[PDB]
Amino acid sequence: YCKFEXATFXSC
């Protein structure tokens, strides 16, 4: 899986 912040994603 990949982590995200909605519209601020910056992981995975």
Side-chain angles (χ1 to χ4, degrees):
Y1 52 66
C2 300
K3 258 137 73 208
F4 45 62
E5 250 72 178
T8 288
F9 156 89
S11 82
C12 177

